[PDB]
Amino acid sequence: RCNGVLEGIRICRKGFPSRVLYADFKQRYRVLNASAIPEGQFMDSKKASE
Amino acid sequence: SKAAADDFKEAFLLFDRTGDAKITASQVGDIARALGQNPTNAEINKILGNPSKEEMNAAAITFEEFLPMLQAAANNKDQGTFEDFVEGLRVFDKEGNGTVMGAELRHVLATLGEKMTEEEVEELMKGQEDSNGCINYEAFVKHIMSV
């Protein structure tokens, strides 16, 4: 609390709450447009999710 | 109503492979589309189940159930607005010209929502997409609404 850590979380949560890490994003959702999302995730760990 | 369109009964004789004048419940989705109705497959699925009708076990039909199911699907044809179809694909690609990159439309039509096979996706792009890899959806949606 006194760190600022809890205040940084606050300010975060006011905003864009949930924030997904890219691989953690690939794996779980590739299946949605399976062909085009898998290619993206594999082809660039980040560029993929994009 | 008849306007009694008796050609719906003549088209049921073209889709019944046994000639007994019954059409299975698995054919009713595609035959409503062939009579000039586009109900989504989840809608065709719901209605069926809604009426405690299981498409999982053997099914038969009679014209006396298929006629009122086509008349219950015929009110939903007011959902077929072409402004929203062309504006959907206009938000799908940048710049002021209606072109989807080939593989974007093919992977979205196979994996997003109601799964269309990649065989049917290739049969719907065949002729409208040339070797530049860019599908002009102004003429593509025009030809899709020509059938």
Rg over CA atoms, chain A: 15
Neighbours of B114 (CB within 10 A): 9
Distance CA A5, CA A1 (A): 6
Distance CA B126, CA B140 (A): 10
At B72, which amino acid appears?
Answer: A
**Mutate which: A30, A31, A35, vs B, most B CBs within 10 A:** A35
- DSSP β-bridge partners for residue B126: B129
Which DSSP letter does residue B33 get? H
Give how far A36 is from chain B: nearest CA, Å: 6
First and final C-alpha spacing in chain B: 24
| Interface list for chain A against chain B, based on CB atoms closer than 8 Å | 31-37
| Residue B24 near residue B61 (C-beta atoms within 8 A) | yes
Beta carbons within 8 Å of B54's beta carbon, 6+ residues apart = B48
First and final C-alpha spacing in chain A: 35
